[PDB]
Amino acid sequence: LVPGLVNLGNTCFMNSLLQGLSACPAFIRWLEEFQYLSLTLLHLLKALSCQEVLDASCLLDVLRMYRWQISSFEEQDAHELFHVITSSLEDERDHPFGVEFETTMKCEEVTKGKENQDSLSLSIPAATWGHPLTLDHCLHHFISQKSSKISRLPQCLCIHLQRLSWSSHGTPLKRHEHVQFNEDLRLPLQAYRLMAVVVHHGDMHSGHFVTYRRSPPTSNQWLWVSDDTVRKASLQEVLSSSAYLLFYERV
Amino acid sequence: KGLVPGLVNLGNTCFMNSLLQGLSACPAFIRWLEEFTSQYYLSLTLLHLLKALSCDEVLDASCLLDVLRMYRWQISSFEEQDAHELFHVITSSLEDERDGSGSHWKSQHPFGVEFENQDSLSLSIPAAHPLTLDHCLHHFSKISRLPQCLCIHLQRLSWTPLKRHEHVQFNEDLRLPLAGGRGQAYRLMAVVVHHGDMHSGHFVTYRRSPPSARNPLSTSNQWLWVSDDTVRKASLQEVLSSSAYLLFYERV
Ligand SMILES: CC(C)(CO)NS(=O)(=O)c1ccc(NC(=O)[C@H](Cc2ccccc2)NC(=O)c2ccc(F)cc2)cc1
Ligand SMILES: CC(C)(CO)NS(=O)(=O)c1ccc(NC(=O)[C@H](Cc2ccccc2)NC(=O)c2ccc(F)cc2)cc1
Numbered sequence: 001l002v003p004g005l006v007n008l009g010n011t012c013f014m015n016s017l018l019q020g021l022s023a024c025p026a027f028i029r030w031l032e033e034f035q036y037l038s039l040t041l042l043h044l045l046k047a048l049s050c051q052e053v054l055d056a057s058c059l060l061d062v063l064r065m066y067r068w069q070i071s072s073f074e075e076q077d078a079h080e081l082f083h084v085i086t087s088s089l090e091d092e093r094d095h096p097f098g099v100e101f102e103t104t105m106k107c108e109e110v111t112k113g114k115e116n117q118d119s120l121s122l123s124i125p126a127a128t129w130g131h132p133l134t135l136d137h138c139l140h141h142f143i144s145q146k147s148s149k150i151s152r153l154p155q156c157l158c159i160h161l162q163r164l165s166w167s168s169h170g171t172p173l174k175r176h177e178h179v180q181f182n183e184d185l186r187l188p189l190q191a192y193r194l195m196a197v198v199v200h201h202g203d204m205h206s207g208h209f210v211t212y213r214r215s216p217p218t219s220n221q222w223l224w225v226s227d228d229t230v231r232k233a234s235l236q237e238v239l240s241s242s243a244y245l246l247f248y249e250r251v
Numbered sequence: 252k253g254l255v256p257g258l259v260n261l262g263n264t265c266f267m268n269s270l271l272q273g274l275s276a277c278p279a280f281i282r283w284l285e286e287f288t289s290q291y292y293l294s295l296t297l298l299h300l301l302k303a304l305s306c307d308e309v310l311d312a313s314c315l316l317d318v319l320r321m322y323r324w325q326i327s328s329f330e331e332q333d334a335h336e337l338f339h340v341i342t343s344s345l346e347d348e349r350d351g352s353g354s355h356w357k358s359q360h361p362f363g364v365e366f367e368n369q370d371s372l373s374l375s376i377p378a379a380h381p382l383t384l385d386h387c388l389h390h391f392s393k394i395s396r397l398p399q400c401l402c403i404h405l406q407r408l409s410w411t412p413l414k415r416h417e418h419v420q421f422n423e424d425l426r427l428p429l430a431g432g433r434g435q436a437y438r439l440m441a442v443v444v445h446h447g448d449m450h451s452g453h454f455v456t457y458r459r460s461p462p463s464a465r466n467p468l469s470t471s472n473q474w475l476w477v478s479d480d481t482v483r484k485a486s487l488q489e490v491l492s493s494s495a496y497l498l499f500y501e502r503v
Contacts, residue, residue, distance in 0.1 A: 067254055068484045076488075084486055091253070091473055094466055111426050111436070 002216065004053040004228035011056070012227065013078040013198075016209040018056055019225045020196035020247045022048035023213040024156045027096045037062045038092050041085070049216045053228045063088075078200075078209065079121070079160045079245065086118040100152035115148070119158035124165075124175050135159075135181040135246075143188070153190050159246040164204060174204040178242050183235070191251045193218070197238055198245035212238040253460045253473060256308040257480040261316070265479060266334040266443075268312055269454040272477045273441035273499045275304035276458040277400045278468075279361050290354045293318050293344050305461045309480050322347075334445075334454070335371070335404045335497065342370040365396035373404040376415045383420035384498075388427070397427060397435045403498035407445060414449040418494050423487075425500060436503050438470070442490055443497035454478075457490040 002022075005015035021027060022045040031042035040062045047054055063070055066088065073081055086097055101115045122138040138161065143150075163175050183194035196213035212233055215221040224233040255275075258268035274280060284298035296318045303310050319326055322344055329337050345360050362370050372394070374387035387405070407415045421439070428434040446453035455478050460471040476485040 066252060066484060067482070080486055080488055083488070087472055087487065091460075091471065094463075094469060094472070105426065107428070109428060113424060113426075113436075 001230055002048060002051060002213070002223055002225065004225060004230045005048075005056050006053055007227045008057060008060070010074055010207045011060075012207045012209040013081065014059065015056060015227055016198045016211040016225070017078075017082060017245070018044055018059070019048055019211040019213055020198050020245065021045055023196040023216075024096070024247055024249055025049075025218075026155045026249060030096045034089075034092065035062060036092055037066065037085075037088050041089070051216050074207070077164050079119070082158065082160075082245070083118055095154070096156040097154050097158055098152070099150065099154050099157070101148045102151040103146065103148040105146045114151075119160050121160040121162060123162050124177065124179065127177060133177055133179045135161075135179050135185070135243075138179065139187075150187075153187060153250070155250045157187075157192055157248040157250070159248070161244060161246075163200065163242075163244055172204060174200075176242065178240075181239065181243060181246065183239070185248060192248035193251045194238075194246065195249050196245075196247040197241060197243050198247075199241045200244045209244075212241060253463075253471070254482055255304055255306065255458070255461060255475060255477065256310055257477065257482050258304070258310055258312050260479045261313055263330065263452045264312060264316075265452045266454040267315070267337065268479050269443045269456040269477070270334075270338060270497075271300055271304055271312060271315075272456040272458050273443050273497060275301035276441040277361075277499055277501050278305075278462075279399050279501055281305065283358070283361050287345075287348075287355055287358055287360075290352060292348065293322060293341070294348055297341070297345075333408055335373075338402070338497075339370055361399035362402055364394060364398045364401075366392060366394060371402035371404050373406060375406040376409075376417060376419060378417070381420060382417055384422070384425070387419065394427070394429065396433065397429065397502075399502050401437050401498075401500040401502070403500070405496055405498070407494075407496055408449065412449060416494060418492070421491070421495055421498055423491070424503070437500035438503045439498065440501045441497075441499040442493060442495050443499075444493045445496045454496075455493075457485055457493060 005018065028045055028049065031038055031045065040058050044056055044059055060070055068084065097118050099117050099120060103113050103115050105111045122142045125137060125141045127133050161179060164172060165175055166172050185192045196211055199210050201208040201210065210226045213223055213225065215223055222233040222235055222238050224231050258271060281301055284294055284301065288295050288298055296314050300312060300315060316326060324340060342360060342362060349356055349358065364372060374391060376382065377386060377390055405419060409415055423439045424436065426436045441456055441458040444455045444457065446455060455476065458475055458477060460473040460475060462469055462471060474485045474487055474490045476483050
């Protein structure tokens with residue numbers, strides 16, 4: 001068992017994401033290699049690792065004291081919080097999640113630039129009849145896509161599936177469809193092993209966020225965390241879930 | 252920690268505080284002003300304001316209006332014109348300070364672009380199919396030589412006046428082509444954004460944080476939302492999604 005975290009009104013995504021991040025030991029190690037946000041984040045993550053209930057108001061307070069208006073983030077996609085944490089951890093340095101793309105632009109002449117991202121955000125493609133939605137199809141659809149190729153892969157990989165779509169009328173909707181994912185995922189040139197899965201439940205304006213993650217030691221027994229409620233979980237329960245964020249580590 | 256000081260609103264100076272926060276996010280402009288003021292005036296007071304803004308203090312931009320009064324400008328006329336015109340009234344008067352100088356008369360400011368030598372690249376917004384900055388650049392007597400500090404003015408005012416609301420894509424890196432090595436690459440330093448109807452004075456600047464004293468001359472990754480006295484952080488996605496009015500870029 002791992003400690004749970006309490007909900008401060010709406011906190012569910014933050015504690016789901018903290019539970020996911022604690023299941024990334026290289027990210028933990030890099031924080032160890034590093035009041036400032038990195039140390040609070042390490043304290044939160046090391047407490048959620050290493051096998052009562054906890055409180056992560058310290059994270060909200062260090063963010064606010066850095067003049068971040070967190071109450072405007074419940075109106076955005078949950079994933080933008082993750083991008084804020086990684087972008088603020090890079091401010092303390094100047095990266096375990098960093099993926100790096102080499103892009104070429106042309107229209108006579110060409111120009112090769114470099115771009116960096118904290119995760120891989122994949123559009124959920126339309127399901128054709130007779131073939132289920134797989135994460136390899138989304139990854140291939142994101143790779144196919146001014147060109148862009150992956151030229152540096154991260155040690156810890158975050159994969160965000162854009163479950164929040166927007167109609168042509170401008171009104172938003174949640175894609176409920178299930179994407180098949182395996183715990184062993186080979187990125188086409190490296191190989192990665194699944195560590196945690198953040199899932200969303202209910203309508204889009206509900207904040208019901210839940211994390212499946214591995215037990216701390218790499219271990220083999222999965223855990224379901226919804227705030228204070230922590231229990232044992234099977235792998236088929238993890239793989240049958242409707243994934244929103246996937247946290248992998250390089251094998 | 253990593254914040255900038257805010258500014259006050261005297262009547263309606265909200266665009267002016269927006270422009271000052273945008274202009275102090277260009278380090279090459281501040282270096283040019285530090286060199287031009289070694290003569291010894293708009294350049295001296297403007298550099299004082301910009302050097303203060305790029306560092307919970309709040310400063311008084313009132314002094315800028317005063318030197319705008321001492322250089323024989325009407326000021327109060329600017330409420331009946333487009334906001335960007337005040338920028339021209341800055342740059343033109345700086346060029347007027349270039350002439351009549353026996354010390355630094357060949358020291359041109361970093362915003363000048365050759366076509367004619369102009370102060371900023373004004374682009375008219377077409378209609379459509381999302382709008383992107385490259386569509387506006389393609390719709391643009393072409394550019395001849397590119398400035399060190401680049402200002403892009405998007406024509407949100409069309410004509411009886413009309414406010415254009417449509418969002419246009421812009422990127423943190425922007426490359427512009429010319430014949431040979433003349434074309435150049437720029438990085439986004441600040442975004443001035445308009446809100447509300449065309450006569451609302453609501454202007455907001457998204458600007459990068461000042462460089463740290465542990466890594467000087469290294470550009471920060473953090474962005475700030477600035478509305479007069481109110482300064483807060485802002486994510487990158489918030490900056491890239493805003494209906495931009497002015498785009499301040501620096502040559503990389
Ligand atoms: C509360 C606080 C901001 C601190 O006060 N922190 S938080 O708990 O981490 C935190 C809590 C909630 C959110 N947002 C949401 O749930 C949005 C809310 C939302 C819904 C529609 C349009 C914009 C915003 N929907 C999702 O993301 C979502 C993701 C996948 C889905 F399939 C369906 C929905 C973000 C962060
Ligand atoms: C001297 C003083 C301190 C006081 O004026 N200057 S100031 O504060 O910097 C200063 C403050 C405001 C303005 N202009 C406006 O609001 C015009 C007002 C206006 C509107 C229609 C026709 C003529 C004039 N609208 C804009 O530009 C505008 C830009 C982009 C948009 F999508 C929508 C509107 C100019 C200057």
